[PDB]
Amino acid sequence: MTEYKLVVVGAGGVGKSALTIQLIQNHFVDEYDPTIEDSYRKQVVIDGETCLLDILDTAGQEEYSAMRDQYMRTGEGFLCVFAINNTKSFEDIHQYREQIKRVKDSDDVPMVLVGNKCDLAARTVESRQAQDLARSYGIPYIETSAKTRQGVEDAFYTLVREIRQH
């Protein structure tokens, strides 16, 4: 079947694993459990197409740079995640986007900007500023909560659709 190589990136603790585990395992992980590199393979049906989601859940730790170019080259689509209560994670998005573009030789790679932890009250990043950033990249902006599952399928399925349209 058609396989989609999806890669979730972003700063440490923004919820990359929590989003992925919600998608694949239907629950919220509330624990501290930093990732090195996890792979998830799941057969799904999206818009009537049988497909395999091949998802790589990456490390936010900056001490894992080298591993990054490797996975950025083979991924077809990227979720670039920040947390809406962590401005530094938002500011970091530019560095992940630039790194992906450079290793993929492309300024138009399938990507979604994901503002996670939208269940939380203490927001520090306004949705308008992330939407503006996303428009500047020409990609969709989707807000999510791994906690409540708000937006989770929407983000991953939107990314699959971006890959389909590439």
Ligand X SMILES: Nc1nc2c(ncn2[C@@H]2O[C@H](COP(=O)(O)OP(=O)(O)OP(=O)(O)O)[C@@H](O)[C@H]2O)c(=O)[nH]1
User: Which residues bind to Mg ion, rule: CB under 5 A?
Assistant: 16-17, 35
Judged by DSSP in three states, 125 sits in coil
The torsion angles phi and psi of 112, rounded to 5 degrees, stand at -125, 135
> Per the annotation, where are the binding residues?
13-18, 29-35, 59-60, 116-119, 145-147
- Residue 33 or 108: which CB sits closer to ligand X? 33
84: Cβ–Cβ under 8 A, 6 or more apart, which residues?
115, 116, 117, 118, 120, 123, 124, 125, 127, 130, 143
The partner in contact with residue 15, picked from ligand X, Mg ion, none with C-beta cut-offs of 5 to 8 angstroms by kind, is ligand X
Q: How far is CA 16 from the centre of its chain?
A: 6
The partner in contact with residue 147, picked from ligand X, Mg ion, none with C-beta cut-offs of 5 to 8 angstroms by kind, is ligand X
Residue 64 touches ligand X, criterion: CB under 6 A: no
Interface residues toward ligand X, by CB under 6 A: 12-18, 29-30, 32-35, 59-60, 116-117, 119-120, 145-147
